[PDB]
Amino acid sequence: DLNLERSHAQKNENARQQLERQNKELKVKLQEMEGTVKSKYKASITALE
Amino acid sequence: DLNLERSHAQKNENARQQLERQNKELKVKLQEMEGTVKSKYKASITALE
Amino acid sequence: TDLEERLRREEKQRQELEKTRRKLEGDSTDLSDQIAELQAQIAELKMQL
Amino acid sequence: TDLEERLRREEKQRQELEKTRRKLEGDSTDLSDQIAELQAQIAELKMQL
Amino acid sequence: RGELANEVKVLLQGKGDSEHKRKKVEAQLQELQVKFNEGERVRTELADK
Amino acid sequence: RGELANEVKVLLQGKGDSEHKRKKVEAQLQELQVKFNEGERVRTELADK
């Protein structure tokens, strides 16, 4: 039973690395896209006004 | 050690579940932020033009 | 002689409780993860609204 | 006498599993009810949307 | 439409309250049913002696 | 008006069917509750024997 707990925990450890990388890319993607799209759109609307 | 190992494994499952849960919310937020920004700005640009 | 079955019966309780706990633990992960995707889907309807 | 002392060891392990199993049972049952509430909320938002 | 819509609120809200209590009662039945075997198992162990 | 008149016919039947199911489920729950209380009392009495 101890080997199963360590085996299952070790198997999930490798999956945690992939989830951590996706979280950093998703947060940086939404923040960069939002700040870039909103900045370029606000500047264009201000020039037209 | 088995009980202590299960606590670490159980804690890892909660942390891993939080990453998976946050990933689903992150994808939903990025998919909604892109539509709310691309739509609220596209219609405004047409009015200014 | 009753201690042989009594001691073995107590050990069987741990296996029975572990089997039910392991089954509920694995099922709870899928059920808990489904709640995250379900709650995240509500954000789309609220954000799209 | 030694069997009685050793028999009590299984009771301690069973108590630790009962608390975890009982917590998962109550949490699993509560999680099922949350799925029904979340599904109903999605229908109200989807119908209104 | 307003009168008919108001009549649906008293029936829709009333049906939801009954369904909510039914889910809670059903959840308690499953817990008591599963817990019922625990009392019988523990009783059979003591009764076996 | 057409969609409201159709949902009323289906909601009225759902409330009646759910009410009858709750009554039957409550009947079995009461019997299980009496057996659960008897098991606990008989369990403690069996320990004294």
- DSSP calls for A1-13: -HHHHHHHHHHHH
Alpha-carbon distance of A24 to A45, in angstroms, equals 31
CA nearest to D27, candidates F8, C27, C44, C3:
C27
Q: How many helices (H) and strands (E) does chain E have?
A: 1, 0
Alpha-carbon distance of A16 to B20, in angstroms, equals 9
> Do B17 and C32 contact (CB within 8 A), yes or no?
yes
Q: How many residues does chain A have?
A: 49
Token couple for C3: 């201690």
**Which residues of F have a CB under 8 Å from any CB of E?**
1, 4-5, 7-8, 11-12, 14-15, 18-19, 21-22, 25-26, 28-29, 32-33, 35-36, 39-40, 42-43, 46-47
Q: Is A31 on the interface with B (CB under 8 A)?
A: no
> Do C38 and B25 contact (CB within 8 A), yes or no?
no
**Site from A13, A26, A33, A44 to mutate, B interface, most B CB atoms within 10 angstroms:** A26
Chains near E with 3+ CB pairs less than 8 A apart are C, D, F
- Whether residues E49 and C9 touch (CB distance < 8 A) is answered with no
Scanning the structure block, which residue is given the tokens 């009646």?
F16
CA nearest to C28, candidates B28, E38, B23, D32:
D32
Alpha-carbon distance of A21 to A18, in angstroms, equals 5
Closest CA of chain D from C46, distance in Å: 7
Alpha-carbon distance of F34 to E40, in angstroms, equals 13
